Amino acid sequence: GSLLPRLPSEPGMTLLTLTIEKIGLKDAGQCIDPYITVSVKDLNGIDLNPVQDTPVATRKEDTYIHFSVDVEIQRHLEKLPKGAAIFFEFKHYKPKKRFTSTKCFAFMEMDEIKPGPIVIELYKKPTDFKRKKLNLLTKKPLYLHLNQTLHK
Template identity: 65%
Template sequence: MTSFEKSVEKWGTALKKSTDFDSWGQLVEASKEYIRLAKLLRMSAVSTDCADDNKKRVLLKIATCLETRSKNLNSGNSSEDIKLEDLKKLIPVLQSLTSVSVKDVPVAVTAKVEKQKQIRSASNTPSSDNEDDIFQNTESYAAAVDLCKQQNTPVATERVENYLMFGVDVHIQVPLEILSKGSAIFFELFHYKHKRRSTSSKCFSFMELDELKPGPCVIELYRKPTDFRKKKLNLLTSKPLYLHLVLTITKQL
């Protein structure tokens, strides 16, 4: 038995354990197990243990479903998210990864998380334009949103004229070749409101896959709320304010 086959066996057991917790009403335990398993699946999808692109796609789909279910349990909203019955359908799919004929995640299940766009990039260094009527402080941070997990940068390190400077790299550990058509990379800018003592979204931006090219780039800022469907887009301001990035795309030999 290969290391990958052993892993699949352990994942199947873990998924059964997670759904058992879920069905018994132990939602906290179920949520933690879903997240733990999702991380393992994503790590395997980008490792050398799984060389089959089809299996990688299946692993990422299952991980997405697990994370969505975990988020659903934590929010208490089940109107449009993954249900327990959906996750039980994933057990035979996961087990099929060791067979010649690999099953795919049911379309009825993946359709429920289709609205959550896959947000990926190889590496980027963000900075953002800024004016007094746009942001009143440097306690802001940019967020690169993943299909399952949001990655937050530290707060802006400094403000230079109309710019908020972040100076950090955000690495997305998923090959671009795996991303499906229509995927995009979204960036959200959050700022802290002292009077309300709360963090709020200010604006967002995104990049299509065909825009991912090495080097510096400038992309437009749109008004909140973030629209992952890219249907209702309104510029943040008529002033020349943009998100500045430097992209680095690496290839594994």
């Protein structure tokens, strides 16, 4: 993993913690060494922040992988540009290919940052960091479940 510590607080500014609770996937339990890459991209799909990888999740069920990990967003919210989005890319080891593959992704726009639980739908790889063209992974109620906490 490469999860970074919370930034120092700045007066009058706000820091976001996203707790990645779990991810629903039809084939969750089949996914080997699953993890999530969290990035913050501008309108044009360019990294505004350092990319962060969760550690590998070990708590697997048939249709959920439990993470229960906090990710610290590496910029005070008021300093993010209006078209930014936070991406969550679910990655796993493909044993027939012997490499790590991005299976699917979720994202959230700036106007979706609000306290409390949120569920976000998954879109099929390859990740579109401009989120212009999206292919839904499943219509089943299998989502990425997050908790948002806004600090000061």
